Design a protein around this nucleic acid. Structure first.
Length: 156
RNA sequence: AGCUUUGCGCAGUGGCAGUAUCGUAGCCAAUGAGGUUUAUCCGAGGCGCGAUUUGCUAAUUGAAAACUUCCCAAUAGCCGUGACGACUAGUCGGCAUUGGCAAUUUUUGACAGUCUCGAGACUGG
């Protein structure tokens, strides 16, 4: 309001205002579509791979389940490849679980090691939901408590 | 029967030893430590804290450097002299101590160097 009192800006057209209006309307369409996709992918990924979704987050769980080629290919991958799963001058030897929110929830030098912590345990989680045990996700909850317990252990 | 591999133990030669060798009871660690190289790859301990027995010998200071001393008194050659003694003023033997013992015959150095085949020669300017 303070800088709308002094804008130094000229008015738009009617075509310019309606062009910006439909641009903002399709932008809200893209935002609501993104959140609809997010809700569906978290629901169906908590059904398909509950423990991996609990550890990493179900969108990144779906990304590393897809680029590996499903759960039954994600299990028989080691922990040192699921770290680099989704890789490609921005950061090297990084996968989809380096740019996760739970691996960016810490200082920038605390990052790489944390990737190896989230890659290993979720690999266990991936193996745990390659067979259909722990459908409620208790292995994911226990391992995720272990993850952020180690994160709080490293932090001050 | 011989050869031989791997791990461990013992001893020995040699090498290394504070960017070395360990402890860790605190935490983490193959359910993955730690990764800038080659990363759909590698794979072992890591971070902190804390350390780096025993016998022998030398040397120094110190009065004393840790295994059951100093001090006084006396005892442990010959020419003269004094007595005692012996033998005829003289001689001899032993004992004793109240002066002396580097000037040719002795005990305060004619010795030292050299040369020749047990024996001699040369020099000491």
């Amino acid at each position: 309001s303070v800088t709308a009192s002094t804008t130094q800006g000229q008015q738009l057209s009617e075509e310019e205002l309606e062009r910006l209006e439909e641009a903002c309307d399709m932008a809200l369409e893209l935002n609501a579509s993104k959140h609809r996709i997010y809700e569906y992918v978290e629901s169906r990924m908590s059904f398909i791979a509950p423990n991996l979704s609990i550890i990493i987050g179900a969108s990144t769980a779906a990304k590393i389940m897809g680029v590996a080629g499903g759960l039954t290919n994600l299990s028989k991958m080691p922990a040192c490849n699921i770290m680099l799963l989704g890789a490609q001058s921005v950061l090297p030897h990084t996968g989809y679980i380096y740019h996760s929110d739970i691996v960016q929830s810490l200082p920038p030098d605390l990052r790489r090691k944390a990737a190896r912590l989230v890659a290993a345990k979720c690999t266990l989680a991936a193996r745990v939901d390659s067979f259909h045990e722990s459908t409620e996700g208790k292995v994911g909850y226990e391992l995720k408590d272990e993850i952020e317990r180690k994160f709080d252990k490293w932090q001050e």
